[PDB]
């Protein structure tokens, strides 16, 4: 676990793109914090760059080649999804979280079920396994065609959770789904480290 941590490249400098965010979301802290603003959900704009059904947002930064690593603090947020979305993938309407349609995601449900959104009709449940992760690390390598996820809760260690190995298309955008607030039960923010 100590090796993984050191083998990772410098932390990617990312910022949430406000123009792509679902209308219920608000971006703050110099683009490093995003959460649902429970006031009066306004209608989505006419720009296809903005998610209108998925309560998500992408980073300003597009990735096309090389290796990249970034971390996201999720804390005790019970429901979220993280990964990347292909630049050519649709962002409007109900989205289908499968690689074939441009989404490569790892998500959490009920605050305890970690699942990989593999090419299938049902996500693959993974092992927590010991303690609820509070920070997720994402490693993207175009040369190796992989997107891997790690439990990055421990400052000096990384525990593998899952990895997509099929060749990845380019470019892609780091993707973050905050999900519906679930009657105030899932109001926690997603934060870029």
UniProtKB/Swiss-Prot annotation:
The record's subcellular location field reads: Cell membrane, Sarcolemma; Cytoplasmic vesicle membrane
Residue ranges of every copy of the B30.2/SPRY domain listed in the record:
1-193
**Its family?**
Belongs to the TRIM/RBCC family.
How is this protein organized at the quaternary level? Answer: Homodimer. Homooligomer; disulfide-linked. Oligomerizes on the phospholipid membrane. Interacts with DYSF and CAV3.
- Domain notes, please? The RING domain is flexible in both the dimer and oligomer. Binding to the negatively charged phosphatidylserine lipids is mediated by the positively charged PRYSPRY domains and is inhibited by Ca(2+).
- State the protein's purpose: Muscle-specific E3 ubiquitin-protein ligase that plays a central role in cell membrane repair by nucleating the assembly of the repair machinery at injury sites. Its ubiquitination activity is mediated by E2 ubiquitin-conjugating enzymes UBE2D1, UBE2D2 and UBE2D3. Acts as a sensor of oxidation: upon membrane damage, entry of extracellular oxidative environment results in disulfide bond formation and homooligomerization at the injury site. This oligomerization acts as a nucleation site for recruitment of TRIM72-containing vesicles to the injury site, leading to membrane patch formation.
The protein's name is Tripartite motif-containing protein 72
Species, as recorded: Homo sapiens
**Lineage of the source organism?**
Eukaryota, Metazoa, Chordata, Craniata, Vertebrata
Identify the gene encoding this protein.
TRIM72
